[PDB]
Structure formats: structure tokens, C-alpha cells
């Protein structure tokens with residue numbers, strides 16, 4: 649999930665948008 | 670919802686927990 | 691933009707209050 | 718541990734900004 653993906657390496661705003669509704 | 674309820678008047682910790690999963 | 695700014699603080703508070711439960715934030 | 722907790726705080730602020738009127742769920 650989001651923590652595994654984006655607290656291990658930087659996520660861009662495009663990558664984070666994948667976790668929106 | 671939360672904005673109507675807690676940005677017009679201060680919400681307690683107890684009131685905010687209403688919005689937890 | 692005050693409602694936007696208020697929502698920013700709301701989300702940080704829900705993060706802290708909800709803990710492992712997590713939360714939902716719908717504008 | 719602590720760094721994950723702190724990371725999560727930044728994550729939620731970013732989701733708030735990017736998700737806009739859609740909003741989001743934060744499920745750790």
C-alpha cells in the first residue's frame with residue numbers, strides 16, 4: 649500500500665494520485 | 670460532513686473520531 | 691480559501707486521532 | 718517505527734492537496 653511504496657522511496661504527485669478516490 | 674461540522678465550530682477529539690475508519 | 695486551509699488541519703488531526711484505524715476525508 | 722509515523726503525516730497532507738474534491742481514504 650501507500651506507506652510501503654512512498655515512505656521507502658519518494659513518490660511524485662502523479663504516483664500519489666493513484667491513492668485518491 | 671466534517672467540514673460543515675468542524676470548520677464552522679471547533680470539534681473535540683471525541684467528535685473528530687466520528688470520522689475514523 | 692479558508693475552508694481549504696481548515697481542511698488541511700483537519701486531515702492532520704484525523705491522522706493523529708484515528709491511528710491504525712485510518713480515516714476518510716471527503717470535501 | 719517513528720520515521721514511518723512521520724512519513725504518514727506528510728503523505729496525508731500530500732493526498733489532501735492532490736486528491737482535491739475527490740478526497741481519499743488513509744488505510745495504513
Ligand SMILES: Cc1cccc(O)c1
Pocket residue numbers: 654655657658659660724727728731
Ligand atoms: C509527498 C510525499 C510525502 C511523503 C512521502 C513521499 O514519498 C512523498
Ligand SMILES: Cc1cccc(O)c1
Pocket residue numbers: 674675676678679680681696699700703
Ligand atoms: C483539531 C481541529 C482542526 C480543525 C478544525 C477543528 O474543528 C478541529
Ligand SMILES: [Zn+2]
Pocket residue numbers: 695699
Ligand atoms: Zn494553517
Ligand SMILES: [Zn+2]
Pocket residue numbers: 723727
Ligand atoms: Zn515532518
